[PDB]
Amino acid sequence: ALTAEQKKEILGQYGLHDTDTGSPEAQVALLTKRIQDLTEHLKVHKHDHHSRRGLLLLVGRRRRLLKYVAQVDVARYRSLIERLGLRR
Amino acid sequence: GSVIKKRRKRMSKKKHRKLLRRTRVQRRKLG
Amino acid sequence: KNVPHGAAHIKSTFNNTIVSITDPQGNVIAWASSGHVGFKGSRKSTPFAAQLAAENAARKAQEHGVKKVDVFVKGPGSGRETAIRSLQAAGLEVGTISDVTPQPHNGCRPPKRRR
Amino acid sequence: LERIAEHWEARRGGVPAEAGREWRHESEPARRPGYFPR
Amino acid sequence: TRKCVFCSKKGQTIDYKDTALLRTYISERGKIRARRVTGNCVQHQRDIAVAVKNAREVALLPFGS
Amino acid sequence: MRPYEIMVILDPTLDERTVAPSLETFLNVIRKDGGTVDKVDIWGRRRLAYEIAKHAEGIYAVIDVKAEPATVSELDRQLNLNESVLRTKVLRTDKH
RNA sequence: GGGAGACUGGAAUUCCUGGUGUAGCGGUGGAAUGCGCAGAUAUCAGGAGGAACACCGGUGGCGAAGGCGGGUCUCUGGGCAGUAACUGACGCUGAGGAGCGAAAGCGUGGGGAGCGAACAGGAUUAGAUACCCUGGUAGUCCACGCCGUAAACGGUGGGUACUAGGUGUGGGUUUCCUUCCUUGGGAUCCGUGCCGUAGCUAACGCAUUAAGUACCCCGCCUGGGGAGUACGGCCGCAAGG
């Protein structure tokens, strides 16, 4: 997974304030970074199915968090989607 | 459970597989 | 020739036993087998046949000048102790006893179990 | 007559097998030393 | 039973370089001794076995002399 | 930059006096690569447990190095190509 | 011993070469086919290759399941404990659907030591399309893809709360005997076994890891054969599902 400095930088960038780590924005940003790293790893090891299952779990968790953020407030959802370069 | 039921099922399955093997080319040519 | 000190190799399988007195460099100078002393079939897996083969090999080594020997036993136990005892009893001095049985580190597949 | 056969093929499954696996009435008793193994 | 001499406050670290510390843990045939005979904990038993294998791989311990 | 421990075995035919410079120029790849530090220790001329490459004795060397994974693999690859190195082994002195 | 990749170690089997060396070896309940006398088996030295990793190693660990242990390095997934900083119900289940899924099998290309369906002899037998023996091809192995089944079983779907205890064992935090060496002992959280209450069950048994007491969601059953078969359809190169 990500190192402490990458987590610190992502949290400082996407966090709602300078302390929050459990906001849906911060969680979704960290999940997106983790998913990109996993996709790069799986591009080389095509037959690493056990890690692919973890990738699926992360994707599902991010989808649920985005569902919550969209239901709570659509403007935040749109801002996050445009800032992170996601489709849905 | 008694293995008798498994025996009946296995004999039915074995006979059906034998029948399928005996008519493979005939089935291929009719289908 | 004259080899005062040599090595004795005993291979005891489940249906035979082969004794070969060996020059310490690995050259064989006299060998006797369970079937070489008049046994055949299942008769040659018996400890008595092992005793006879060991005695015959010991004599055939003795006229070659072999006086002291060290044994290297090997194989499933059938007549190993009997073979060593017969080696000693035939006028041969037995120095050291070593069990060298090939032990794989889980390589190669054994044959299927008999029924 | 089938149950009476008593030739080798009829008694090959009842002859004790293995060395330590399985036990039968006519199975060869294990050889035991004088002193306890310890 | 017996003591895991490594869980103690004086437990020396397990290495593949110190040969004697491993020689005390293998039988006279060069085989690795069992845990119940040795008495050490599971983690230390794994450390010992790995160290013995590594030492064998660099010809510091015989492969079953 | 992770810490590594490298143990090499050199054939005993060569003199023990030239072992230290020969390793020293070998570790020049790790040194100029990434500002990396070594602590070479030599305790050679020990008979091996089993014969290696038609040899019974060997010269043992222990190298403690802190470098990048790509650099160390490069050093390991070079060492095996050299004919005076009988065997070598790389450990990670980290938690691993 | 969670997974993927790369490199690499030793024992053993087989084969090849060269010494010593002779007449048997091999196999069985007992033998014979078979190998050897053109120098076998045995013993020693050297070489080639493939596969599996003794001891550690267990009712012990990890994984959703299938499953996973020679060593090292690289990349990567999950779990647990403590603090409780953060968000503030974001939870559960899940028709269809998608993915993974032992072994055997299938396609293309390599590899092939041992084992070994088929196939050959030998033996046993009234007969042996078998059991046993000697050989032995696919296959087993690798790369990339298909297949999609298993006694794929704990024959026990998932989540949650509650309901006597006793005793092993794995991981972690902590108070007190304190030598603080010691499974010292306790408490606690998460696993994994055994024995046992209440309760449940036709019985066997289960029993805080429920088959007890309840709530939410899903799958399935409705006498035995015919039959998981025919017909039609979908998937598959085919086997077939």
Numbering used by the authors:
A (entry chain p): 2 to 89
B (entry chain v): 2 to 32
C (entry chain l): 23 to 137
D (entry chain w): 89 to 126
E (entry chain s): 17 to 81
F (entry chain g): 1 to 96
What does the literature reporting this entry say, word for word?
Mycobacterium tuberculosis encounters hypoxia (low oxygen) as a major stress in the host macrophages, and upregulates the expression of RafH protein, which is crucial for its survival. The RafH, a dual domain HPF, an orthologue of bacterial long HPF (HPFlong), hibernates ribosome in 70S monosome form, whereas in other bacteria, the HPFlong induces 70S ribosome dimerization and hibernates its ribosome in 100S disome form. The RafH binding would block all known critical sites of translation initiation: the decoding center, the a-SD sequence of 16S rRNA, and the bS1 protein at the platform binding center of the ribosomal small subunit.
Multi-body refinement further improved the map quality and resolution to 2.7 Å and 2.9 Å for the LSU and SSU, respectively. RafH NTD binds to the cleft between the head and body of the SSU to a similar binding site reported for HPFlong NTD, HPFshort, and YfiA in ribosome structures. The W96, which harbors in the mini helix α3, makes stacking interaction with the G673 of h23. The linker residues between W111 to F124 extensively interact with the nucleotide stretch, A1518 to C1522, which harbors the anti-Shine Dalgarno region of the 16S rRNA. The RafH CTD binds to the mRNA ‘platform binding center (PBC)’ composed of proteins bS1, uS7, uS11, and bS18 with 16S rRNA helices h26, h40, and 23S rRNA helix H54a. The small subunit of 70S ribosome in the RafH ribosome structure adopts an unrotated closed conformation in our in-vitro reconstituted 70S ribosome RafH complex.
